[PDB]
Design a protein around this ligand. Structure first.
Ligand SMILES: COC(=O)[C@@]1(O)C[C@H]2O[C@]1(C)n1c3ccccc3c3c4c(c5c6ccccc6n2c5c31)C(=O)NC4
Ligand SMILES: COC(=O)[C@@]1(O)C[C@H]2O[C@]1(C)n1c3ccccc3c3c4c(c5c6ccccc6n2c5c31)C(=O)NC4
Lengths: 619, 650
């Protein structure tokens, strides 16, 4: 469609226009901003000034300027930039599985990358003014997706106002705190899936309502009825952990602050201390413990110095399980190493979650495990009245939330299976040593039976041929014979082989044996269809089909969870029996070893006593 | 003058009148049920006003019925007291037993019997009806209206018993003249209006028998008499079928048509017996080359008394049927299998359902395990070639009938409803056969798996014995090595002052180097590795649909066609049906590929097992000698030492 030697023109990246160019020879990719339009002298200057700013700036989180390919013939120059393979953040936010916000890993890398870029811009005295998901592009790094800032210019109308700091509608002059507002609204949208303050509301009405919020309010929303509610708390559903939700909630209060001068001011780090505040949150080292007793995830911020014993004492307060009874296991069934620090649980990209470095907690005191999430306000609201007609935009929100609820049921249920598999892995690892010991015991018993048989044969000859050639020796030898009768732990080994054999049966029955996975795929496809519905077909309707799926998923979940706990309590009773048998086997192998030592000595002594007879006779 | 809401049909004491058992006419045979005992009866009544000839004809029937007594002939029962009052005239009623299985026409009409009845059902029919006709003819009675409507099924203690009914056309004998019977089973002679004999009942039995084997009558069904007579007259002595093809050509054949549910031998032997019965010549009909005139019953007796053995060659996927004698040895059968499969006696691995190898010196009849549910699958033996390392994943499915392969080639062809009904039933039957054939192959793979697991069991039992013997030997050797080292040390220590026996020292030193060579620890070690690696492959083998659904789909499609109203019965393609068969053929060969992949995996394991068994046996032997020698050498040394003490004590 257009070429420049090896440089061939590709698809439009967005709208003058931005188009991708690919080098046929090197495989190199570039983005070119072009204007075929005729501009006013001020906007002409504005265009040139941007190319100049870009050429000056150099940062890992700011799109790099590139040379315009030689021979790339309005009169205004082109803006050649690096091509970011990941695409814009709006595209990511629009992925159907991100309707209720992005994953935890994706949020931490966003926050980090955009805070670092904003810091560079502001220190080089560049104020963005139009920061939004459309102005954030993702580049493919070596191990993760890197967020970069674009458009450093120097629904439709209501659309443009969506990330603007309130002062911008009110006055002319502004400060860096305009970019805090934008970063905060943006960040919130990535956590929750929607903007903090009454999205798509008309400016006059928006301004009048949001003005009324308190210093601690980070969300102003309209329910289905349509009550406007203000909140200090980060909304649910979100894919963040307990601690991160709590800590990002308070950081957002700094950023979504109505007061323009007070915005970004940290109580510790003073004005513009919002970047140092986030640094603390991002540098936190978190440990996630799943209490198998209750099924709740406990998150603990740990220090590099913090010992496993300190963490155990902290788990103790939230679970009621004493340090001594705490069995802490990981994915593969290994118990946590006490010499090592609490940070041992920690194993950083967009695919990072709490599930990655998750530890499963079991109570050694428990013999049996009895089975023990609250859906958002809008979901429980539609559960009560599923036949209610909702406008398409309202349908889109509750359906995404219902789908998210089911995904959570599925994910929650799989974490419990992972916990049961960790306990099974530990059991199989113990059963392995138990088998290795059983075989040694079996082998030692057979070797002992053999040596005893041989000694019994040997001594019988020696007793016969002695009496034939006619004291203290005869009585001593007869004691040797009755003494070796008492050793041999055949009957004790017998019983332990029965137990060890009966145990391995229960274990093979445990390892030798969904709809909840299916109900999620059903809900996902139903939500997919709603969002892929043509604009003319977007009308009013019921949530009957969706609410049907959630109820079936709840029912399926509790049924599936019952079975997980039945197998867990079966696994733990096997683990007990195993731990009970190990010393019993060890003890019998010890006894047998002494029996062998005794047979060996008694044989050596008798032989030496016979050569002694031959001495006396040789004189 | 008022309408009653009661629904009691008509009573006679404890006896409640139920439905008519017949199909058309006034309702001559009706079922009666005893409310108190639960007993059921059938009552035949004559027509109200009769001509003196038909009055005489009626009496003659009552007389014949009263005389007759046979397990396969419905006997005359006492008329319940008070019923003769409710009779149309002075003439008696015919009270008979009620046969709960119903008539044979009902069975022939069951949609799953469109291509004939099952092999078990054919053998019990033939046996029961031959015995009844034999009884009649020996007691000089000719039936003259034998057909499926005149055969009823009674519930026996272990099977369904076929019985003969309706002696209303029957004559006591001699030659007869009367134009009596059913057009569809009417012997040529009766249409020629000639004098005739018992051979009229042979024709009826033969046409009937054929219809039960194939699903349709032998000679041009539903053709008008004049046209029928003109065409069927032209058949040869050996022809048992005259039919109309898809292109309407009338074809004559000596052979029994396909599809049928009979085995190879039974089809061949019943084919030639049918030539005797469907013989145009009236005097020659039923004449057997061995048993002479009227020897057709003794001929069938031979066929029925045959003891058959069904062998499934797993290499090809074909079933070989062998008529065996009570004296016939397994070796004779093996020699017979050899000719049809090319597998020598020594390479023949013959297994049954549960994976047990056939016992030589037991007779060939050991393979044989008898009602309507009896099949060749019951007493089936699976043949494997010990020479084979791998089995070919393709085996060629069964050759489908002439009409099926004809419509497979051109499915868009329009056929008349009656032609559609035939090919669709046949296509449905082809799919059922694909399903059945495929399951037999799985059974063969499971028999080989069962044999493997049985062998692996003994192999495990031997491994443990070997392991145990090895540990016991290691122990005794350790002890002997310790013992002899003491004895050698304390001897050399006492040479100068004590006893010097150069002969003893050398003998004892030989004992010591001799026991160094024995102990088979490293040999046992390797066998435990192999035995362990084998058991892995075996657990991987044992720890590892659309063909049945495609059949249900075809069954429903054929069902729909048959239940189609008479006005709606028009022309059509077999596109929907041919689609299903192609899918079934594709599904079958896919399923069969998997069966053979696992079979060749099973047989390689079975080889390794049979390779390991002697190796284990050999090492345990060696170890046993090592033990024997240790025990002896120890005893001898001890006795030699006490001998030194004798010499020193003198
Ligand atoms: C409608 O799209 C937009 O608003 C974008 O800001 C977002 C979108 O196009 C715009 C115009 N955009 C811009 C608007 C203004 C300046 C630069 C860009 C821009 C760039 C890139 C991309 C891009 C790459 C892959 C998918 C989408 C992409 N976009 C851009 C860039 C890029 O890779 N390098 C520069
Ligand atoms: C055209 O012929 C028929 O329909 C039958 O032969 C076949 C039919 O009714 C008839 C009239 N029939 C007869 C015609 C003539 C004599 C006896 C029967 C007869 C009998 C029975 C039955 C019977 C039982 C169950 C279903 C249908 C049954 N039928 C009969 C009997 C029976 O149980 N005992 C005798």
């Amino acid at each position: 469609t257009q070429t420049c030697g090896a440089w061939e023109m590709k698809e439009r990246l967005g709208t003058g226009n931005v188009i991708r160019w690919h080098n046929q020879e090197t495989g190199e990719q570039i983005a070119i901003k072009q204007c075929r339009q005729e501009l006013s002298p001020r906007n002409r200057e504005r265009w040139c000034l941007e190319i100049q700013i870009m050429r000056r700036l150099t940062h890992p989180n700011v799109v790099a300027a590139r040379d315009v390919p030689e021979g790339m013939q309005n009169d205004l120059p082109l803006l050649a930039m690096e091509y970011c393979q990941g695409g814009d953040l709006r595209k990511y936010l629009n992925q159907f599985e991100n309707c209720c916000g992005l994953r935890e890993g994706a949020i931490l890398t966003l926050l980090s990358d955009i805070a670092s870029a904003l810091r560079y811009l502001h220190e080089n005295r560049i104020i963005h003014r139009d920061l939004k998901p459309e102005n954030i592009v993702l580049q493919q790094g070596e191990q993760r997706l890197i967020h970069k800032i674009i458009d450093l210019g120097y629904t439709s109308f209501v659309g443009t106002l969506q990330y603007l700091a309130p002062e911008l509608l009110e006055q002319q002059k502004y400060t860096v705190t305009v970019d805090y507002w934008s970063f905060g609204t943006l960040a919130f949208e990535c956590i929750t899936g929607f903007r903090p303050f009454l999205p798509n509301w008309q400016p006059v009405q928006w301004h009048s309502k949001v003005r009324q919020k308190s210093e601690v309010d980070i969300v102003v929303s309209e329910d289905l009825n349509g009550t406007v509610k203000f909140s200090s708390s980060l909304p649910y559903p979100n894919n963040l952990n307990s601690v991160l939700a709590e800590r990002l909630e308070k950081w957002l209060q700094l950023m979504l602050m109505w007061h323009p001068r007070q915005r970004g001011t940290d109580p510790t780090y003073g004005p513009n201390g919002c970047f140092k505040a986030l640094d603390d949150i991002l540098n936190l080292k978190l440990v996630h413990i799943l209490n198998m007793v209750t099924g709740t995830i406990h998150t603990y911020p740990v220090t590099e110095d913090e010992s496993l014993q300190s963490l155990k004492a902290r788990i103790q307060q939230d679970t009621g399980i004493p340090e001594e009874d705490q069995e802490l296991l990981q994915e593969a069934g290994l118990a946590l190493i006490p010499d090592k620090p609490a940070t041992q649980c920690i194993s950083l990209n967009e695919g990072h979650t709490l599930d990655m470095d998750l530890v499963f907690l079991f109570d050694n005191s428990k013999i049996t495990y009895e089975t023990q999430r609250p859906q958002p306000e809008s979901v429980s609201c539609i559960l009560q009245e599923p036949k209610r007609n909702l406008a398409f935009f309202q349908l889109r929100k509750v359906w995404g939330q219902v789908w998210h609820s089911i995904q959570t049921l599925k994910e929650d249920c799989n974490r419990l299976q992972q916990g049961q598999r960790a306990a099974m892995m530990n059991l199989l690892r113990n059963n392995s040593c138990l088998s290795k010991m059983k075989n040694s015991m079996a082998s030692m018993s057979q070797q002992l039976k053999a040596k005893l048989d041989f000694f019994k044969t040997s001594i019988q000859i020696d007793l016969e041929k002695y009496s034939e050639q006619t004291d203290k020796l005869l009585l001593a030898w007869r004691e040797m014979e009755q003494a070796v009768e008492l050793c041999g732990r055949e009957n004790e080994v017998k019983l332990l082989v029965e137990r060890m054999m009966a145990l391995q049966t229960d274990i093979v029955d445990l390892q030798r044996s969904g709809t909840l996975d299916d109900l999620e795929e059903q809900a996902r496809e139903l939500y997919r269809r709603l969002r892929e519905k043509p604009r003319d077909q977007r009308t009013e309707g019921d949530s009957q089909e969706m609410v049907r799926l959630l109820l079936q998923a709840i029912q399926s979940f509790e049924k599936k969870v019952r079975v997980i706990y039945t197998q867990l309590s079966k696994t733990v009773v096997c683990k007990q029996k195993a731990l009970e048998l190990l010393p019993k086997v060890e003890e019998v192998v010890s006894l047998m070893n002494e029996d062998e030592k005794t047979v060996v000595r008694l044989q050596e002594k008798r032989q030496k006593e016979l050569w002694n007879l031959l001495k006396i006779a040789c004189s």
